[PDB]
Amino acid sequence: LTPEQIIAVDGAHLWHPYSSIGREAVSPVVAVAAHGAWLTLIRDGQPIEVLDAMSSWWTAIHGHGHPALDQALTTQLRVMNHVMFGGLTHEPAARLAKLLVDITPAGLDTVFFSDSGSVSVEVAAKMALQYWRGRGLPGKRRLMTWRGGYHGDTFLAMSICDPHGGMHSLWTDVLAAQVFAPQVPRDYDPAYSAAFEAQLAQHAGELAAVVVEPVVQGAGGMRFHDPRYLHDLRDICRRYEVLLIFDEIATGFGRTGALFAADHAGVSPDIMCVGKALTGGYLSLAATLCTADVAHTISAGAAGALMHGPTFMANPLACAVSVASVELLLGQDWRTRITELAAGLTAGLDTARALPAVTDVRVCGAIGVIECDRPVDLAVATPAALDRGVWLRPFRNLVYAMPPYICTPAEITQITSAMVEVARLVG
Amino acid sequence: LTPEQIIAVDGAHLWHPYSSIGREAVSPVVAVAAHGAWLTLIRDGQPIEVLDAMSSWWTAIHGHGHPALDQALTTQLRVMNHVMFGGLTHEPAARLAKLLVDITPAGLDTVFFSDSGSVSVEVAAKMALQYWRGRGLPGKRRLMTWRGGYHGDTFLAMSICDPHGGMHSLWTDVLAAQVFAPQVPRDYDPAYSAAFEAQLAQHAGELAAVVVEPVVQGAGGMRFHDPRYLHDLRDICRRYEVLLIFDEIATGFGRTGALFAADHAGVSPDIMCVGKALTGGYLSLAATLCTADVAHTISAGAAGALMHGPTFMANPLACAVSVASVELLLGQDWRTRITELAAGLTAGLDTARALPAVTDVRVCGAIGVIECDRPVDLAVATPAALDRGVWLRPFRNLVYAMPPYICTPAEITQITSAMVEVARLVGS
Ligand SMILES: Cc1ncc(COP(=O)(O)O)c(C/N=N/c2nc3ccccc3s2)c1O
Numbered sequence A: 001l002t003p004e005q006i007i008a009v010d011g012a013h014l015w016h017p018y019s020s021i022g023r024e025a026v027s028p029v030v031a032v033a034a035h036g037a038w039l040t041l042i043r044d045g046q047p048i049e050v051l052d053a054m055s056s057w058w059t060a061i062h063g064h065g066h067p068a069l070d071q072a073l074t075t076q077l078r079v080m081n082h083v084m085f086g087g088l089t090h091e092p093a094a095r096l097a098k099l100l101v102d103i104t105p106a107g108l109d110t111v112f113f114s115d116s117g118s119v120s121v122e123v124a125a126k127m128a129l130q131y132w133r134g135r136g137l138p139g140k141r142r143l144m145t146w147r148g149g150y151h152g153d154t155f156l157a158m159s160i161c162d163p164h165g166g167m168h169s170l171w172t173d174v175l176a177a178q179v180f181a182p183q184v185p186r187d188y189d190p191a192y193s194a195a196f197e198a199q200l201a202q203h204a205g206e207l208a209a210v211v212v213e214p215v216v217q218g219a220g221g222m223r224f225h226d227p228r229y230l231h232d233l234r235d236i237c238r239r240y241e242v243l244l245i246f247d248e249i250a251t252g253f254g255r256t257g258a259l260f261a262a263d264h265a266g267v268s269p270d271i272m273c274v275g276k277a278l279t280g281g282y283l284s285l286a287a288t289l290c291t292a293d294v295a296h297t298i299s300a301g302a303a304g305a306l307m308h309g310p311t312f313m314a315n316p317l318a319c320a321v322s323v324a325s326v327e328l329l330l331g332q333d334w335r336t337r338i339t340e341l342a343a344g345l346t347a348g349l350d351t352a353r354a355l356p357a358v359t360d361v362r363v364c365g366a367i368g369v370i371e372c373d374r375p376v377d378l379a380v381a382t383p384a385a386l387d388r389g390v391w392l393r394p395f396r397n398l399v400y401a402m403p404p405y406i407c408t409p410a411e412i413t414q415i416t417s418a419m420v421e422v423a424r425l426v427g
Numbered sequence B: 001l002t003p004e005q006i007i008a009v010d011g012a013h014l015w016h017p018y019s020s021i022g023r024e025a026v027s028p029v030v031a032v033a034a035h036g037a038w039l040t041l042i043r044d045g046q047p048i049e050v051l052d053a054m055s056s057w058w059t060a061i062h063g064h065g066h067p068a069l070d071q072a073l074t075t076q077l078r079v080m081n082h083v084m085f086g087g088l089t090h091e092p093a094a095r096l097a098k099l100l101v102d103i104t105p106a107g108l109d110t111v112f113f114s115d116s117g118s119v120s121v122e123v124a125a126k127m128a129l130q131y132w133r134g135r136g137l138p139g140k141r142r143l144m145t146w147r148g149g150y151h152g153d154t155f156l157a158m159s160i161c162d163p164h165g166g167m168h169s170l171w172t173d174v175l176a177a178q179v180f181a182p183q184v185p186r187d188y189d190p191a192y193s194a195a196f197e198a199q200l201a202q203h204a205g206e207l208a209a210v211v212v213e214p215v216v217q218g219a220g221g222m223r224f225h226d227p228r229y230l231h232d233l234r235d236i237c238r239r240y241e242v243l244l245i246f247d248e249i250a251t252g253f254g255r256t257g258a259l260f261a262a263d264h265a266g267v268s269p270d271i272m273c274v275g276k277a278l279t280g281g282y283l284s285l286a287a288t289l290c291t292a293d294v295a296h297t298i299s300a301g302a303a304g305a306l307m308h309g310p311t312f313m314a315n316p317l318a319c320a321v322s323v324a325s326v327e328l329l330l331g332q333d334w335r336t337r338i339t340e341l342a343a344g345l346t347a348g349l350d351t352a353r354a355l356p357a358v359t360d361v362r363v364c365g366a367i368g369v370i371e372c373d374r375p376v377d378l379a380v381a382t383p384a385a386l387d388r389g390v391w392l393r394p395f396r397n398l399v400y401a402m403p404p405y406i407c408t409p410a411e412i413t414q415i416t417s418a419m420v421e422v423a424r425l426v427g428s
């Protein structure tokens, strides 16, 4: 297929994410290659190199086509593509489980693999519900969260998306009714935590768990909060016997400047979800971790088992590339790498603060955000970014980047420049 | 890691499907390699080769490590591992979409990719509900199915599982309450369809869709039903204005002796789920296809867009290997291959019919089932199967195989002999 033929087939047959069929304002751009931090895209019938400023939706932390990951994949392919995980186990699953237990917050001792982020969220909810069922308290079946959150697109995940402003707002009438605290503020305010506790207390007997994105709320608005809130959440959940679940599908593997965002507060949740950067952006994989207590209570309950098990659970290929990606990250001074990226993002975005359409500029580890005073038009932003050698995808009123960790200083500069000029055009 | 170290790590840290932690019992067996129709497993420290009689749960239709599929994957790896599908498109996704639209039942014109069977089912439900909202009928929000079914493990997918039940009871009081018709029988009885219609009719104004596995019910009991029932469902759904969803995640890609099980009935659903054998069993990928009417009705509704988009949607690696898997299937006389497999399963499993513990023996395309009168003890069945060089995994009272399409007559003879032996051991 030529780029023209791809565009034709795509228009006729392919549904894109969060899109209509036949009435999308912008057509998709054909991608033809990816290497390191760079994508080869077709523009006006000509190939162009652009920086993957978004790391392919926060996955490609080591960039594309990294020799260590390519080889981990080809080596596993030579041995064993896949086998079912029912009654069988294998080396990639064992190596990965051991890595994930060792590097996640203390006490997360068990790993349930699944195929995607939304599934790992559903598994976390199932763990929480079965846990209380195992304690003979089946009335603890609701979830609590704060506003501004997002946890995926399957029906239980949607139930904890922000109900009046989140992407699943039109569905609230068919979703499980969960408990929502107000939007968590950026600055630490003890009064916020007190109000959260007072609200949780009213519902404790019907709550299985608090589920939140720690430190960084992504799809809900790339908002940052003070890590001390997580300390309060841990304290509150412990004192009211509510399980705490951290969804680290976006925040994991160094992105926020700590290995996991929970680490900014030194907090351990009872249950944790991971995905995205887990595989280095090669293949779909996610995991849900839980404590020995949670696992044993589920296992010693009336069910005797966790009632979940996906087809390609613990796929050897996906596990193998994930092992290599985690080892690649752990084997370098990743913390200094992220500190350097953050400094680059900070310095490069500083000049946006004075732009007339810009209401905030904020950086957290390798995440850079320009918040604008109006929704950003993709028909303007997309060409403008491409004209500057950068793939950027704004959403809502936000121009943002989460670059591969391999980006050089010059590359970060180029990314921040494109973002600044996008914000300038908005205004 | 050595196989002993794998076991140690596994026992401490790994959750297995529908299992416990620390309460096994019976450790899992270490798999160290897979090639063609064979797995290499560690039994008492010894590596042994055994037949993958279940195709690693329906997936490995061309066997493991097929040269054409390995090559397709490595070719794509060198060019582009993965890009975001938000505002970007690529050759593997386009190539695969065109193939799937061409080989599926008439009228399924648009493809939404996801990463697993359960997700594709959630996407199909969302399409159905959003369709009716786009017609100003938001009360059409429930699903209807028949008993014996399985559609995955996410909370919406659980709500249409057989309650009585694949894994209900514990949950029923937290799941969406769907409408269930009685177990669809093996043999065609027009009275069953009339009763299904009457039940549906009273719920029509609150129903978005009927969702069923066509011809073969997998995890819910490895049961088969006359394809004519699907013709009736198509008709009932048409007349009462309820969408029809076929979940072909297990039945797809030739398994039942037709390219898709719907083809046995010569009927097209409004929405269709595919997965598993899609990728030749290399990687997780699934797809939900719908008609032009479904897609446009969603897209013209005030809601507008379908708010769904998995991170790895339309992953180039997974799409690349799938293209190669589908082309490899289509470029051979697959129909004769399945007919021969059905023949070998029938001939091999014949012995079982006369066994004391055996209540049914049944074959449909490349699927063979021995049903027993009591649960099959794994402690007995496993060594018996392994002694015979075959990996089998009975569940409930069922001994079954869904072998790779590449299996030779000798291999089918080996597989069925292991099954007959397991059944023989049940009733003694
Ligand atoms: C915290 C959290 N939990 C669960 C999920 C769901 O993962 P999947 O969409 O099933 O792969 C996600 C997926 N989020 N993906 C995102 N993509 C973008 C893109 C632009 C801006 C924000 C986001 S969040 C998540 O962030």
Ligand SMILES: Cc1ncc(COP(=O)(O)O)c(C/N=N/c2nc3ccccc3s2)c1O
Residues within 6 Å of the ligand: A309, A310, A311, A312, B057, B116, B117, B118, B119, B121, B150, B151, B152, B153, B213, B218, B219, B220, B247, B248, B249, B250, B275
């Ligand atoms: C019809 C149907 N729909 C959805 C799913 C869910 O797929 P995922 O497990 O989420 O990838 C499935 C998954 N089925 N897995 C099965 N494994 C076995 C194993 C032995 C016998 C039957 C089955 S069905 C399915 O069969």
